[PDB]
Design a protein around this ligand. Structure first.
Ligand code: N5Y
Ligand code: N5Y
Ligand code: N5Y
Ligand code: N5Y
Ligand code: CL
Ligand code: CL
Ligand code: CL
Ligand code: CL
Lengths: 293, 293, 292, 293
């Protein structure tokens, strides 16, 4: 089957003002590359090439200008806007026509993932053509997230969005895989107390059909978010330490495309020319002559 | 005599791409506030209220939307563009009519200053009705900056822009105070071997007339630039550590305007309401009822 | 003349297991042992005669690291605090070290940075009467001695770790005292938590109208190293300054040289054994470079 | 059938003086725990319980006070001294009697590792009953390390210690596994030009026999090292960001013993007791009542 991608870069509102007055959070860099490269790279690693970027009226054109139609990176990028931040689950109504009768994956524009065998973690979720797949990650502050409770057998048995009394420390990450049933589930949602269409409700519909796979994203993986000024800074230092230690970049879309055989040497060479005088173009150039396992 | 301020927020070119592809360096935040807030606050602490922000064709309108006419902070802000990055001293040609017959001060849009008695450090440059004043600061890498040589008695005796063999470790910082001669010195300037109208040629012109005052910005002050992704990050951590230690912000313009008796408590409360839900608005609110010495 | 005391006590078990193998104040902040910072602070206050007080197990190690201090133009002595019975116990333990002189006490994990710091210390240190402390605006005053001011800015109360703090002004870990302090310490009774409190010593001066409270402004950095998190921030803060400037913060050898307590020959010989690393190279650079 | 471990916690000479004038590098903390906890945890994760710790004359006794005989953690620890820093390969001479007739592993006392499936990465190598196993990791500065060269088929064809002209960017990490041949190979080593018994000469002897296995430690793992004050600080920040995000600790030996079933609940409870009023003891207590996947 075919699986298409959606990145939701919703508005942070005025939460991070005045820092984000001139530029929305999702267009900020994390260290050396725009924030959106990280979730984009995650979809690419999941085998996904057709991707819809949804954001605000104001930012959607800015992403188009940054990313184009993606043909440079062997992708097919399209855009849509969410006129008002009416909940993450609205992504599937906005993208109904984009999705068609195909499988889909949703990732939030401000989630970074790092770790080993990430291709294989995602592959098993991409492989499932029936039901939904999500990931649970042990966090210190589960109250801020969708929370998954497990029984002593290891079976997911409940989900709650931002519970006052969380039942575990397992938060659901901002990467979701879905089958063809997601649009209709999305269409029947009602607004929560806060007036949002909630992705946790989508996820609960599958759980209540026994069609939700909840895989553990283990403690050896880094799932970071960019919610506060503080965490933005930590995420930047984290990526800076890996990259400077390794001489290898995290979530460089041009590299991922090249390693997936979606662009060839000659194309990557052309992508490197414009930035040949900075570290990034110099890095793309080096990938043409080095074996990296 | 009245002193007017100029902030040159010129381009970074393609130097920091792809990170700055969607947003220009000087519109990024440093931790919790826009970069430009820091040099703006520096001019405000120096007593300056009439300020011209010069940036690229693309960014000047964005600074204009972020900052407006300045009347909300008791400032008077105007705008002009630098069509091409033909050197820093071009700020005086672009700003000729804005400066008029008055004294002036230039600050770079990407310089952050911190330390004690900063009001007094600037005041003694601001008080000088004739001549020019600049600040020298000990750095690791003087070859990147304008460099000031001193003789055994502490007298400034030479300036070189980015010398290959620096004569000292003292860099001239991106904050400059000038009398009414500056525009005429700037109009006589011809381009250097790197094709720029050099602020260091302006400073040398004052030096060769015996009218340059070089004051030491002591090691107890922090002068950070934001030249690389690495230093941007260090800058962020540095401000974060001060702010979270003290519960006081560095370079909050609303606060400086309020402490300078330029806006009143009413106006401050009115600036605080729209941000009432985030830390920044709350901070502005707290300043209303706490005495800080 | 003023005598100096560095209280490098226990952090108890609260930074365990990181401090299982080492006293907190022997850990480094970036490139140098933590105690170099308060030591440098007392030196900057013009104090050369310094008593270092620590645990029985730690005191020999400070002694190994620092010696008699004569290499840096200082006069260092050592004494032990057998149980962590409170900060104000430094004066009882140090009674005979102090004698009839004026004194100062700095906490071994307090780090300070900023401009004119010599002058901020000079005013307190030159006083020949009463006591002097510094008040610093912090986010978390509950963790500290908290000074309350009236509308004229006069200090009117002090409280140790108040549950409901009267201000955001913490009293920093640097204290200057006239000859009254030892006798005030002697008459103290243990607090609820069973500690001889420095805040009780400072309240005794305040009640006599003999406490001077100066503001350490927001342009100074008073870091402390109370948690693993803050220790790390302190490390990052020092590193950023030093790598920016090419100058070191709280380098006692530098401070001794600049104070004229050791000469260029002496400094050169201190550089020799460290000449293969950045620290010794730094000292050798100081011989030839004028730094304003 | 036993694999025995060695942690070489040598002298960093005077390289990090004066910070290490009072204590050995490997007794410093990386964030919340002593540095040696990290490689210790690494040998524990590889299934190794009998471990010799080698440090200097001055430091060995201090490791003894910190760690004891290891019985509180289900381990069996011994201590020996390296009187002169005459090479890593010396660990096998000093450790000859400790190893006896068993298989062995050597880890450097300042090496930190983090990543997913690390148990499995270590498992394959520790399970081998022949030859030697080492890990190759892409770094920015291969000159500082042993460097492995591969042919176009990925086969290792040469090993060089600190080459002036590195043949690849793949460094051999400070984690080595050996069959019963290493002791005899070590004992026939002669000093290299810098007067050192080289672990790289040991690994080369196995390579020339066709008995060296080089596994790649992929980029999704973090091999941090702690060579400079700068890197030590970065390592601290890295651990801190992981631990505060997750509410789980990296390289907590008590946790590893418990999960390996080498100590029981009651024993973990007793270990928690004296640390109950810091975050580390509370964390041991929470591990009694939480299921962590
Ligand atoms: C280590 N890693 C990641 O954790 C990752 C992060 C975001 C998205 C995808 C991978 C990663 C990574 N594994 N790779 C290798 C790779 C990428 C694509 C196909 C085959 C190998 C890469 O080129 N860049 C990376 O950042
Ligand atoms: C400590 N400090 C500064 O270093 C500073 C930095 C840039 C611009 C202005 C001040 C600072 C500062 N000194 N003040 C106090 C202040 C501001 C204006 C008048 C009188 C006092 C402030 O309100 N905010 C600050 O950030
Ligand atoms: C900038 N500064 C300090 O903030 C400081 C901090 C702790 C202790 C002493 C000084 C400092 C400093 N001002 N000096 C200069 C100095 C040192 C001694 C006498 C006069 C000036 C120095 O040599 N090292 C320093 O770290
Ligand atoms: C994620 N991880 C590591 O990367 C690791 C790092 C150094 C040493 C051992 C493990 C790790 C880890 N996988 N575990 C789980 C574990 C520990 C022991 C046996 C089986 C699983 C753990 O308890 N702590 C950890 O830090
Ligand atoms: Cl894992
Ligand atoms: Cl200074
Ligand atoms: Cl101040
Ligand atoms: Cl990997």
């Amino acid at each position: 089957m075919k699986r298409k991608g959606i990145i939701l870069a919703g508005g942070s509102g005025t939460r991070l003002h005045p820092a984000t007055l001139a530029i929305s959070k999702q267009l900020l860099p994390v260290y050396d590359k725009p924030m959106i490269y990280y979730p984009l790279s995650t979809l690419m690693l999941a085998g996904i090439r057709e991707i819809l970027i949804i954001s605000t009226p104001q930012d959607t054109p800015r992403f188009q200008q940054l990313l184009g139609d993606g043909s440079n990176w062997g992708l097919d990028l399209q855009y849509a806007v969410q006129p008002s931040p009416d909940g993450l689950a609205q992504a599937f109504l906005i993208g109904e026509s984009f999705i068609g009768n195909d499988l889909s994956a949703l990732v939030l524009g401000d989630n970074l993932y790092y770790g080993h065998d990430f291709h294989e973690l995602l592959g098993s979720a991409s492989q499932r053509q029936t039901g939904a797949s999500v990931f649970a990650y042990h966090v210190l502050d589960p109250e801020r997230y969708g929370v998954v409770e497990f029984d002593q057998g290891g079976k997911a048995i409940s989900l709650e969005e931002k519970p006052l009394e969380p039942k575990s420390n397992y938060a659901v990450t901002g990467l979701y895989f879905y089958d063809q049933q997601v649009v209709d589930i999305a269409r029947d949602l009602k607004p929560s107390p806060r007036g949002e269409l909630e992705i946790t409700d989508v996820n609960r519909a599958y759980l209540e059909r026994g069609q939700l796979s909840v895989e553990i994203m283990g403690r050896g993986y880094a799932w970071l978010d960019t919610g506060t000024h503080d965490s933005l800074l930590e995420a930047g230092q984290f990526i800076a330490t890996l990259e400077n230690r390794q001489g290898l970049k995290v979530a460089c879309p041009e590299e991922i495309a090249y390693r997936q055989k979606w662009i060839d040497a000659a194309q990557l060479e052309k992508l490197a020319a414009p930035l040949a005088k900075n570290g990034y173009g110099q890095y793309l150039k080096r990938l043409l002559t080095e074996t990296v396992y």
